[PDB]
Amino acid sequence: PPGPPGPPG
Amino acid sequence: PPGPPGPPG
Amino acid sequence: PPGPPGPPG
Amino acid sequence: PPGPPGPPG
Amino acid sequence: PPGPPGPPG
Amino acid sequence: PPGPPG
Amino acid sequence: PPGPPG
Amino acid sequence: PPGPPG
Amino acid sequence: PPGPPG
Amino acid sequence: PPGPPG
Amino acid sequence: PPGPPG
Amino acid sequence: PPGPPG
Amino acid sequence: PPGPPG
Amino acid sequence: PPGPPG
Amino acid sequence: PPGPPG
């Protein structure tokens, strides 16, 4: 499965 | 039988 | 008789 | 997600 | 956000 | 004969 | 065969 | 695959 | 992405 | 941005 | 014999 | 075997 | 893996 | 990251 | 920053 969202900016 | 899903991303 | 299924992948 | 607003001026 | 007003004259 | 694939 | 993508 | 942008 | 201006 | 004149 | 792996 | 990573 | 930063 | 200053 | 003086 894809990975999770990335950190915010 | 096929193998199981792979690790997430 | 044939042999049994093979291992999973 | 985007980052938060920046400091005031 | 903009900064606050400046000092008087 | 060999069996079926896994 | 190898399984499906993660 | 890599996940979505943050 | 970077956030909005202050 | 800088604020307004005093 | 056992079949091939999957 | 295990599939590829995502 | 984790997505890119925002 | 934090946006630019105002 | 603070605006210019008046």
PDB file of all heavy atoms in Angstrom, chain A:
ATOM      1  N   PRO A   1       0.810  -1.224   0.000  1.00  0.00           N
ATOM      2  CA  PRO A   1       0.000   0.000   0.000  1.00  0.00           C
ATOM      3  C   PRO A   1       0.841   1.270   0.000  1.00  0.00           C
ATOM      4  O   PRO A   1       1.992   1.258   0.452  1.00  0.00           O
ATOM      5  CB  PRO A   1      -0.822  -0.145   1.275  1.00  0.00           C
ATOM      6  CG  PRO A   1       0.161  -0.809   2.200  1.00  0.00           C
ATOM      7  CD  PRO A   1       0.767  -1.877   1.324  1.00  0.00           C
ATOM      8  N   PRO A   2       0.305   2.390  -0.511  1.00  0.00           N
ATOM      9  CA  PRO A   2       1.166   3.575  -0.462  1.00  0.00           C
ATOM     10  C   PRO A   2       1.593   3.836   0.972  1.00  0.00           C
ATOM     11  O   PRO A   2       1.101   3.184   1.914  1.00  0.00           O
ATOM     12  CB  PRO A   2       0.283   4.686  -1.019  1.00  0.00           C
ATOM     13  CG  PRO A   2      -0.621   3.955  -1.957  1.00  0.00           C
ATOM     14  CD  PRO A   2      -0.961   2.696  -1.187  1.00  0.00           C
ATOM     15  N   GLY A   3       2.513   4.773   1.122  1.00  0.00           N
ATOM     16  CA  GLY A   3       2.951   5.151   2.440  1.00  0.00           C
ATOM     17  C   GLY A   3       2.029   6.275   2.876  1.00  0.00           C
ATOM     18  O   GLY A   3       1.166   6.708   2.093  1.00  0.00           O
ATOM     19  N   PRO A   4       2.186   6.765   4.121  1.00  0.00           N
ATOM     20  CA  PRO A   4       1.386   7.846   4.676  1.00  0.00           C
ATOM     21  C   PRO A   4       1.834   9.214   4.202  1.00  0.00           C
ATOM     22  O   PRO A   4       2.949   9.365   3.653  1.00  0.00           O
ATOM     23  CB  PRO A   4       1.585   7.673   6.174  1.00  0.00           C
ATOM     24  CG  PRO A   4       3.033   7.282   6.221  1.00  0.00           C
ATOM     25  CD  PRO A   4       3.111   6.238   5.144  1.00  0.00           C
ATOM     26  N   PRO A   5       0.975  10.227   4.378  1.00  0.00           N
ATOM     27  CA  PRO A   5       1.306  11.612   4.009  1.00  0.00           C
ATOM     28  C   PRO A   5       2.693  11.968   4.538  1.00  0.00           C
ATOM     29  O   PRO A   5       3.238  11.266   5.366  1.00  0.00           O
ATOM     30  CB  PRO A   5       0.212  12.436   4.674  1.00  0.00           C
ATOM     31  CG  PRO A   5      -0.965  11.514   4.551  1.00  0.00           C
ATOM     32  CD  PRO A   5      -0.420  10.133   4.820  1.00  0.00           C
ATOM     33  N   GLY A   6       3.261  13.046   4.024  1.00  0.00           N
ATOM     34  CA  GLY A   6       4.561  13.478   4.473  1.00  0.00           C
ATOM     35  C   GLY A   6       4.391  14.567   5.479  1.00  0.00           C
ATOM     36  O   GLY A   6       3.273  15.041   5.715  1.00  0.00           O
ATOM     37  N   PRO A   7       5.488  15.019   6.085  1.00  0.00           N
ATOM     38  CA  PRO A   7       5.451  16.074   7.091  1.00  0.00           C
ATOM     39  C   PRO A   7       4.891  17.361   6.545  1.00  0.00           C
ATOM     40  O   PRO A   7       4.838  17.558   5.314  1.00  0.00           O
ATOM     41  CB  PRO A   7       6.918  16.190   7.528  1.00  0.00           C
ATOM     42  CG  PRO A   7       7.649  15.831   6.271  1.00  0.00           C
ATOM     43  CD  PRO A   7       6.886  14.631   5.773  1.00  0.00           C
ATOM     44  N   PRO A   8       4.434  18.266   7.428  1.00  0.00           N
ATOM     45  CA  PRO A   8       3.913  19.529   6.896  1.00  0.00           C
ATOM     46  C   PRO A   8       5.089  20.341   6.347  1.00  0.00           C
ATOM     47  O   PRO A   8       6.247  19.892   6.384  1.00  0.00           O
ATOM     48  CB  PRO A   8       3.233  20.194   8.107  1.00  0.00           C
ATOM     49  CG  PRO A   8       3.007  19.051   9.054  1.00  0.00           C
ATOM     50  CD  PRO A   8       4.258  18.224   8.891  1.00  0.00           C
ATOM     51  N   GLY A   9       4.775  21.503   5.789  1.00  0.00           N
ATOM     52  CA  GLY A   9       5.796  22.357   5.236  1.00  0.00           C
ATOM     53  C   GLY A   9       6.269  23.382   6.231  1.00  0.00           C
ATOM     54  O   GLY A   9       5.749  23.477   7.348  1.00  0.00           O
TER      55      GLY A   9
END
